Design a protein around this ligand. Structure first.
Ligand code: SRM
Ligand code: SF4
Ligand SMILES: O=S([O-])[O-]
Ligand SMILES: [Cl-]
Ligand SMILES: [Cl-]
Ligand SMILES: [K+]
Length: 538
């Protein structure tokens, strides 16, 4: 790698970061959008106020404003559903470590309730909230309302640092390694500039995903993150070994690799900043399929990339990885659904199943009520799109289990439902090839009617090759496609994946059978479960 390759390609100009004039050749259309107008201005210079007043039919008549609503608004966490819900916006938060409050939950419910049949909410595979139905004129008031209840939606889409994932059992599990909340909180505060916006990390070549590990279970999926902090002691000091570059895409899925770096716990934010600066400064900005950070690591080599991180650390110091980390390889991933004792004597948490992560306003209010009556007003989201209500006096559990809403959001659903994960799909997503959430529920119900089993088989349904529902981590994965029935008629189908493993002995699954009509999946899956997962016909 020539020394010229290491010249930073962006510069700070009037508070924002922009591609230098000599590096603008050959860039992709999204890079052109960012140059034409700085997306962060919509928030930081309150550009959204005037934009929100323009009727959407008028907005669509000019490239600048159409790009504002279809692209730049994703820096404020707003996602125009142009194809499938025209004129409505999905809104995505920052929710470090998946932690929410009852007050926040009620606020989100009040927003979606306004939109009737156009509104609902979802828990995401990054233990985050999305709300639906938002109209542009309401955006300024919603931004204000979110701020009032201690939420931000900043920098949650496009070329930004995505939700910081942590241990859903942080602070409450007798078996945790380290409470991840302080670290994910710090990362979120850094990324968003304490909810004011942070332009230094908002002009990346591509999205970038961080997680902090605190569980032996590896609930955080460090193997598939751009930056994973693995807790490790080095020379008698607590800190983290760093894994880099994990990502999924239509083209390529790669597990994170060691940076060969350890940082003391207090250096979590400094090293996040150094890695982001290196990626920002040096990353390819051509073909979008070659812009994730792993591509930079392959171009420079991991050592070349490491040197770039090191030069951006305070005092330019970056220690080598500790030979061992604190994560025990002898471990069985634990079910968190149901009632479990906390490390605080006399308290329990309860994991509740949320079918395919989908809730309505009334459901959110009920969950918020439970958290107030039984817990401490806290609701935690998980990456399997479920919830945990912590801090429940154990004496209250008997009464809790009789609550009617627990028949719908159950502490002990059938085993296949416990592990079922599904993305948005074509109900709302314009990229989706098939419908996912309703279909996956229907198929899983029919499968479980036919077989019993004891192994916690994890089934993931994703609507297109972007693999937001991570089919490559599943015991059985389903990737949306169009295929043909026996008569040659177009029908929805799935490419079926096998081989995904999570925890310390992680592995990426691969396509097992292509183009199976969705209507034909039940017998295929029943047989797979019996033949490979010890299932028994009923
Ligand atoms: C909501 C969510 C799936 C869910 O049902 O849970 C989702 C939904 C979408 N993702 Fe994703 N992604 C979700 C996690 C993922 C993950 C899983 C993860 O983070 O562990 C991945 C695979 C891992 C990765 O990215 O490395 C993922 C890979 C993508 C990709 C392909 C990335 C690539 O490098 O090619 C895209 C397309 C893109 O960004 O260019 C994408 C694009 C999209 C968009 C924003 C596309 C769009 O504008 O319509 C989807 C919005 C649909 C909607 O209305 O909800 N989504 N997406 C997840 C929100 C996470 C969050 O709260 O921040
Ligand atoms: S995997 Fe495809 S269909 Fe599903 S939410 Fe992601 S982009 Fe949409
Ligand atoms: O929007 S997806 O990348 O989480
Ligand atoms: Cl996006
Ligand atoms: Cl769309
Ligand atoms: K779920």
């Amino acid at each position: 790698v020539a020394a010229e390759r290491l010249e930073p390609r962006v510069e700070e100009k009037d508070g924002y970061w922009i591609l230098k004039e000599q590096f603008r050749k050959g860039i992709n259309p999204q890079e052109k959008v960012k140059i034409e107008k700085e997306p962060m201005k919509l928030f930081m210079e309150n550009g959204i106020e005037e934009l929100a007043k323009i009727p959407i039919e008028e907005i669509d008549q000019s490239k600048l404003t159409k790009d504002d609503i279809d692209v730049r608004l994703k820096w404020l966490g707003l996602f125009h559903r142009r194809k499938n819900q025209y004129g409505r916006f999905m809104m995505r938060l920052k929710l470090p470590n998946g932690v929410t409050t009852s007050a926040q939950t009620r606020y989100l419910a009040s927003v979606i309730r306004k939109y009737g049949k156009e509104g609902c909410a979802d828990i995401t595979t990054r233990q985050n909230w999305q709300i639906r139905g938002v109209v542009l004129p309401d955006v300024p008031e919603i931004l204000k309302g979110l701020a009032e209840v201690g939420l931000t939606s900043l920098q949650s889409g496009m070329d930004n640092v995505r939700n910081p994932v942590g241990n859903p059992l942080a602070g409450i599990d007798p078996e945790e390694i380290v409470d991840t909340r302080p670290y994910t909180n710090l990362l979120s505060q850094f990324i968003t500039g304490n909810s004011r916006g942070n332009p230094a990390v908002s002009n990346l070549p591509r999205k970038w995903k961080p997680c902090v590990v605190g569980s032996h279970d590896l609930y955080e999926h460090p193997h598939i993150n751009d930056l994973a902090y693995m807790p490790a002691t080095k020379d008698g000091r607590f800190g983290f070994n760093l894994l880099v570059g994990g990502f999924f895409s239509a083209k390529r899925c790669d597990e994170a690799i060691p940076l060969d770096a350890w940082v003391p716990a207090d250096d979590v934010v400094p090293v996040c900043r150094a890695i982001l600066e290196a990626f920002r400064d040096l990353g390819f900005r051509g073909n979008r399929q070659k812009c994730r950070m792993m591509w930079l690591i392959d171009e420079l080599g991991v050592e070349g990339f490491r040197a770039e991180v090191e030069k951006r650390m305070p005092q330019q110091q970056l220690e080598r990885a500790s030979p061992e980390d604190l994560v025990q390889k002898q471990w069985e991933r634990r079910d968190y659904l149901g009632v479990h004792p906390q490390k605080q004597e006399g308290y329990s948490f309860i994991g509740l199943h949320i079918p395919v992560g989908r809730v309505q306003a009334d459901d959110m209010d009920e969950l918020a009520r439970l958290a107030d009556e039984y817990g401490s007003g806290e609701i935690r989201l998980t990456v399997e799109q479920n919830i945990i209500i912590p801090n429940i006096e154990t004496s209250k559990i008997e009464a809790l289990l009789k609550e009617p809403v627990l028949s719908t959001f159950s502490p002990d659903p059938p085993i296949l439902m416990k592990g079922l994960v599904a993305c948005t799909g074509n109900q709302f997503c314009g990229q989706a090839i098939i419908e996912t959430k309703a279909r996956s529920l229907k198929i899983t119900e029919e499968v479980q009617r036919q077989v019993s089993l004891t192994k916690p088989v994890r089934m993931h349904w994703t609507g297109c090759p972007n693999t937001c529902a991570q089919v490559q981590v599943a015991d059985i994965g389903f990737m949306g496609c169009l295929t043909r029935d026996k008569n040659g008629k177009t029908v929805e189908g799935a490419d079926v994946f096998l081989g995904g493993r999570i925890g310390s002995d992680s592995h990426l699954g691969e396509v097992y059978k292509k183009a199976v009509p969705c209507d034909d999946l039940v017998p295929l899956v029943v047989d797979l479960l019996v033949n490979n997962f010890g299932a028994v016909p009923r």
